[PDB]
Chain A
Amino acid sequence: PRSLKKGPFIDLHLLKKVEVAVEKNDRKPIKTWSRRSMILPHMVGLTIAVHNGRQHVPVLVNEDMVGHKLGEFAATRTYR
């Protein structure tokens, strides 16, 4: 499945401290409490560290992103 039926990402309990960060300068991250905290494709250039429980990860958000969840920055299996 997972076709492009559900197009835009308007989710008010997950919107209201990521889109509001345009007016405020970039000196701090967007702090995440899901394995699935996706945001809009209008907000490339931010920091989302994958919530799973004990330390945060290097996420290099660069200019070209379209597809899927954040299970690649902090991977599912982490090779312990």
Chain B
Amino acid sequence: RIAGVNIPDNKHTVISLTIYGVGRTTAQSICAATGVNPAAKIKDLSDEQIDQLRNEVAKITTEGDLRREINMNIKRLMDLGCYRGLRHRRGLPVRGQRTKTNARTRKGP
């Protein structure tokens, strides 16, 4: 609604804009020409400093539009016999990294 979801407070505006994944060096070009001052918050400013901080989300993709295509491209690669879906079916490291038994941040249980 205001930043996609409910946001905890008493912190930055630029880190209220950098919320995990596409941003800050885009926002380096945003907060220098828009007029939204980083010197205060979402509430220490008035409400009118947020109106173009709300418009920069519904132009590319949405958290539901992310949920829309979180399975659609996955649907392509499961049932099409591929090696993008031989380990997508299996659970392994996929992009040719350290693959077989016990490297750290790729599989889980």
Contact = CB atoms under 8 A, between A and B. Distances in A.
Nearest to B92: A77
A60 B81 contact: yes
A75 B86 CA distance: 8
A71 interface: yes
Contacts of A79: 86
Interface residues of A, number: 9
A79 B85 CA distance: 13
A53 interface: no
Interface string B58-92: 00000000000000000000001111101000000
Contacts of A76: 83
A73 interface: yes
B40 to A, nearest CB: 43
Contacts of A19: none
A60 B82 CA distance: 10
Contacts of B80: 60
Contacts of A77: 86
Nearest to B77: A72
Interface string A23-41: 0000000000000000000
Interface of B: 80-84, 86
Interface of A: 58, 60, 71-73, 75-77, 79
